[PDB]
Amino acid sequence: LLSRGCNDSDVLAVAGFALRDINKDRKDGYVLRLNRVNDAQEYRGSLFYLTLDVLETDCHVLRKKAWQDCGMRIFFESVYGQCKAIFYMNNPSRVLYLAAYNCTLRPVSKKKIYMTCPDCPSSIPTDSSNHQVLEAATESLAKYNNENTSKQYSLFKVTRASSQWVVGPSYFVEYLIKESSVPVGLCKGSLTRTHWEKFVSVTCDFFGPRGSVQYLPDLFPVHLDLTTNPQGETLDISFLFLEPMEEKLVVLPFPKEAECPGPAQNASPLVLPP
Amino acid sequence: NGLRDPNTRWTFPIPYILADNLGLNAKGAILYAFEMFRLKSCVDFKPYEGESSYIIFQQFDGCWSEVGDQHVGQNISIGQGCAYKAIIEHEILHALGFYHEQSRTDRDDYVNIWWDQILSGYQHNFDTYDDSLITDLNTPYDYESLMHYQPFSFNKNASVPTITAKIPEFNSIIGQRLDFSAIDLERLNRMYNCTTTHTLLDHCTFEKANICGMIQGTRDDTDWAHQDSAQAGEVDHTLLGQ
Amino acid sequence: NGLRDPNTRWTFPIPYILADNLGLNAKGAILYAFEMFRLKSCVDFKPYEGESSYIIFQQFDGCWSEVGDQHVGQNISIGQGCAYKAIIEHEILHALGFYHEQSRTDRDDYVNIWWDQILSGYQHNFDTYDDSLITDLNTPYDYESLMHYQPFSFNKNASVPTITAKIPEFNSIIGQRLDFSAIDLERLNRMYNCTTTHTLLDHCTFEKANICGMIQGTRDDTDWAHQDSAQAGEVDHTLLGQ
Amino acid sequence: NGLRDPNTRWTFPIPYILADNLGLNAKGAILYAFEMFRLKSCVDFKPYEGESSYIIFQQFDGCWSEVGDQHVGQNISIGQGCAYKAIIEHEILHALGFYHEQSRTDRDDYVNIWWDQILSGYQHNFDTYDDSLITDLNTPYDYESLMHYQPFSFNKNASVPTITAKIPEFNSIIGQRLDFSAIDLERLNRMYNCTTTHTLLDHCTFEKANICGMIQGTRDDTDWAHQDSAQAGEVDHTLLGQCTGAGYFMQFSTSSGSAEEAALLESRILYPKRKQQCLQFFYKMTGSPSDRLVVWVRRDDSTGNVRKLVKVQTFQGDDDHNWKIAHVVLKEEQKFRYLFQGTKGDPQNSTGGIYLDDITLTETPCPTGVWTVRNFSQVLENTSKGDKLQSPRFYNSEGYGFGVTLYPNSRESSGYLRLAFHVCSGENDAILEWPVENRQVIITILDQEPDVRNRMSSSMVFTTSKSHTSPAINDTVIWDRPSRVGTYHTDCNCFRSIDLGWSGFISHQMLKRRSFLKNDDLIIFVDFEDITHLS
Ligand SMILES: *[C@@H]1O[C@H](CO[C@@H]2O[C@@H](C)[C@@H](O)[C@@H](O)[C@@H]2O)[C@@H](O[C@@H]2O[C@H](CO)[C@@H](O[C@@H]3O[C@H](CO)[C@@H](O)[C@H](O)[C@@H]3O)[C@H](O)[C@H]2NC(C)=O)[C@H](O)[C@H]1NC(C)=O
Ligand SMILES: *[C@@H]1O[C@H](CO)[C@@H](O[C@@H]2O[C@H](CO)[C@@H](O[C@@H]3O[C@H](CO)[C@@H](O)[C@H](O)[C@H]3NC(C)=O)[C@H](O)[C@H]2NC(C)=O)[C@H](O)[C@H]1NC(C)=O
Ligand SMILES: *[C@@H]1O[C@H](CO)[C@@H](O[C@@H]2O[C@H](CO)[C@@H](O[C@@H]3O[C@H](CO)[C@@H](O)[C@H](O)[C@H]3NC(C)=O)[C@H](O)[C@H]2NC(C)=O)[C@H](O)[C@H]1NC(C)=O
Ligand SMILES: *[C@@H]1O[C@H](CO)[C@@H](O[C@@H]2O[C@H](CO)[C@@H](O[C@@H]3O[C@H](CO)[C@@H](O)[C@H](O)[C@H]3NC(C)=O)[C@H](O)[C@H]2NC(C)=O)[C@H](O)[C@H]1NC(C)=O
Ligand SMILES: *[C@@H]1O[C@H](CO)[C@@H](O[C@@H]2O[C@H](CO)[C@@H](O)[C@H](O)[C@H]2NC(C)=O)[C@H](O)[C@H]1NC(C)=O
Ligand SMILES: *[C@@H]1O[C@H](CO)[C@@H](O[C@@H]2O[C@H](CO)[C@@H](O)[C@H](O)[C@H]2NC(C)=O)[C@H](O)[C@H]1NC(C)=O
Ligand SMILES: *[C@@H]1O[C@H](CO)[C@@H](O[C@@H]2O[C@H](CO)[C@@H](O)[C@H](O)[C@H]2NC(C)=O)[C@H](O)[C@H]1NC(C)=O
Ligand SMILES: *[C@@H]1O[C@H](CO)[C@@H](O[C@@H]2O[C@H](CO)[C@@H](O)[C@H](O)[C@H]2NC(C)=O)[C@H](O)[C@H]1NC(C)=O
Ligand SMILES: *[C@@H]1O[C@H](CO)[C@@H](O[C@@H]2O[C@H](CO)[C@@H](O)[C@H](O)[C@H]2NC(C)=O)[C@H](O)[C@H]1NC(C)=O
Ligand SMILES: *[C@@H]1O[C@H](CO)[C@@H](O)[C@H](O)[C@H]1NC(C)=O
Ligand SMILES: [Ca+2]
Ligand SMILES: [Ca+2]
Ligand SMILES: [Ca+2]
Ligand SMILES: [Ca+2]
Ligand SMILES: [Zn+2]
Ligand SMILES: [Zn+2]
Q: Minimal CA–CA distance to B121: which of A107, A190, A140?
A: A107
* Ligand number, closest to the Cα atom of D222: 14
SS3 for D251?
Answer: strand
Which parts of A26-82 fold into alpha helices (H)? none
Question: What is the phi-psi region of residue B8: left when phi exceeds 0, alpha when psi lies from -120 to 50, beta otherwise?
Answer: alpha
Of D198, D226, D252, the residue at which a domain comes to its end is D198
Q: Is the CB of C119 under 6 A from ligand 7?
A: no
Clarify whether B91 is annotated catalytic. yes
Of D198, D213, D245, the residue at which a domain comes to its end is D198
Q: In degrees, to the nearest 5, what angle opens at C-alpha D216 toward C-alphas D210 and D217?
A: 160
* C195/B140 Cβ within 8 A: no
Query: Which of D320, D346, D349, D354, when mutated, tests ligand 1's pocket best, judged by the most ligand atoms within 8 Å of its CB?
Result: D349
For the four alpha carbons of D16, D20, D22 and D26, in that order, the dihedral sign comes to positive
C20 touches chain D (CB under 8 A): no
Contacts of B45 (CB under 8 A, 6+ apart): B13, B14, B15, B16, B34, B37, B38
CB B147 within 8 A of CB B111: no
SS3 for A98?
Answer: strand
Counting beta carbons within 10 angstroms of the beta carbon of residue A244, is it exposed (0 to 12), middle (13 to 18) or buried (19 or more)? Answer: exposed
Of D153, D170, D198, the residue at which a domain comes to its end is D198
Please state how this structure was obtained. Answer: cryo-EM
Q: Is the CB of D286 under 6 A from ligand 1?
A: yes
Nearest residue of C to residue B215, measured between CA atoms: C109
Measured CA to CA, the distance from residue A89 to residue A16 in angstroms comes to: 12
Residue D75 and residue D2 share a domain: yes
Q: How far apart are the first and last CA of chain D?
A: 36
**Strand B14-18 to strand B55-58: parallel, antiparallel, or no bridges (unpaired)?**
parallel
Per the structure, the complete domain to which residue B24 belongs is given by 1-198
Nearest residue of C to residue D435, measured between CA atoms: C219
Instruction: Using the atom order of ligand 1, give the atom closest to the CA of residue D346.
Output: 49
Element (H, E) at A49: strand A46-60
Measured CA to CA, the distance from residue D255 to residue D222 in angstroms comes to: 13
Contacts of B150 (CB under 8 A, 6+ apart): A168, B174, B175, B177
What residues in D contact C24, CB-CB < 8 Å?
A: none
Q: How far lies D224's CA from each of B216, D217, D318, in Å?
A: 79, 10, 21
CA–centroid distance, residue D316 to ligand 4 (Å)? 55
Residue D456 and residue D376 share a domain: yes
Measured CA to CA, the distance from residue C60 to residue C80 in angstroms comes to: 9
Q: Is the CB of D9 under 6 A from ligand 4?
A: yes
CA–chain centroid gap for D316, Å, is 26
C148 is in an annotated binding site: no
A189 beta partners: A173, A202
Measured CA to CA, the distance from residue A213 to residue A105 in angstroms comes to: 8
Measured CA to CA, the distance from residue D294 to residue D316 in angstroms comes to: 8
Chain C, window 165-224: residues with a beta carbon less than 8 angstroms from a chain D beta carbon: 217, 219-221
Best of C31, C216, C219, C222 to substitute, by most chain D Cβ atoms within 10 angstroms, is C219
Q: Minimal CA–CA distance to D453: which of D197, D252, D223, D128?
A: D197
Catalytic one of D35, D49, D51, D91? D91
* C221/D430 Cβ within 8 A: yes
What residues in B contact C138, CB-CB < 8 Å?
A: 196, 201-202
Measured CA to CA, the distance from residue B20 to residue B27 in angstroms comes to: 9
| Residue C42 main-chain phi, psi, to 5 deg | -85, 5
CB D359 within 8 A of CB D204: yes
Measured CA to CA, the distance from residue B139 to residue C213 in angstroms comes to: 8
D488 beta partners: D495
- Give the experimental resolution in Å: 2.8
Chain D, window 294-313: residues with a beta carbon less than 8 angstroms from a chain C beta carbon: none
Measured CA to CA, the distance from residue C189 to residue C185 in angstroms comes to: 6
CB C105 within 8 A of CB C144: no
Number of Cβ within a 10 Å radius of residue C150: 15
Q: In degrees, to the nearest 5, what angle opens at C-alpha C59 toward C-alphas C57 and C63?
A: 80
Measured CA to CA, the distance from residue A233 to residue A251 in angstroms comes to: 5
Measured CA to CA, the distance from residue D205 to residue D248 in angstroms comes to: 7
Question: What is the phi-psi region of residue D133: left when phi exceeds 0, alpha when psi lies from -120 to 50, beta otherwise?
Answer: alpha
Q: Is the CB of D192 under 6 A from ligand 4?
A: yes
Report the side by side order of strands in the sheet with D45-47: D45-47, D14-18, D55-58, D74-78, D63-65
What residues in A contact B82, CB-CB < 8 Å?
A: 166-167
- Got the DSSP string for B32-75? HHHHHHHHHSS--EEE-SS-SS-EEEE--SS--B-SS--TT-EE
Cis peptide upstream of residue C13 (ω within 30 degrees of 0): yes
Measured CA to CA, the distance from residue C80 to residue C98 in angstroms comes to: 23
Measured CA to CA, the distance from residue D272 to residue D265 in angstroms comes to: 20
Nearest residue of B to residue C195, measured between CA atoms: B190
Number of Cβ within a 10 Å radius of residue C13: 16
Measured CA to CA, the distance from residue B121 to residue A29 in angstroms comes to: 21
Give the one of C195, C202, C213 whose C-beta lies nearest to B190's C-beta.
Answer: C195
Q: How far lies A8's CA from each of A14, A87, A222, B236, in Å?
A: 10, 15, 24, 82
CB C149 within 8 A of CB C100: yes
Catalytic one of B35, B49, B66, B91? B91
Nearest residue of B to residue A169, measured between CA atoms: B154
**Strand D74-78 to strand D63-65: parallel, antiparallel, or no bridges (unpaired)?**
antiparallel
* Composition of chain D by helix, strand, coil, percent to 5: 20, 35, 50
Contacts of A70 (CB under 8 A, 6+ apart): A31, A33, A57, A58, A59
* C210/B144 Cβ within 8 A: yes
Best of A164, A190, A219 to substitute, by most chain B Cβ atoms within 10 angstroms, is A164
Measured CA to CA, the distance from residue D59 to residue D72 in angstroms comes to: 20
Report the side by side order of strands in the sheet with B45-47: B45-47, B14-18, B55-58, B74-77
CB B48 within 8 A of CB B87: no
E strands of chain C, at which residues?
2-3, 14-18, 45-47, 55-58, 74-77, 111-113, 134-135, 163-165
> What subunits touch chain D, counting only 3 or more CB pairs under 8 A?
C
Q: Minimal CA–CA distance to D205: which of D14, D323, D360, D75?
A: D360
Measured CA to CA, the distance from residue D11 to residue D68 in angstroms comes to: 11
The CB-side HSE value for D50 (13 A sphere, CA atoms) comes to: 0
C90 is in an annotated binding site: yes
Q: Minimal CA–CA distance to B149: which of B170, B121, B135?
A: B170
Measured CA to CA, the distance from residue D374 to residue A48 in angstroms comes to: 88
Please state at what angle helix C85-95 crosses helix C24-40, rounded to 10 degrees.
70
Contacts of A179 (CB under 8 A, 6+ apart): A151, A152, A153, A154
Cis peptide upstream of residue D367 (ω within 30 degrees of 0): no
Measured CA to CA, the distance from residue D307 to residue D336 in angstroms comes to: 8
CB D1 within 8 A of CB D65: no
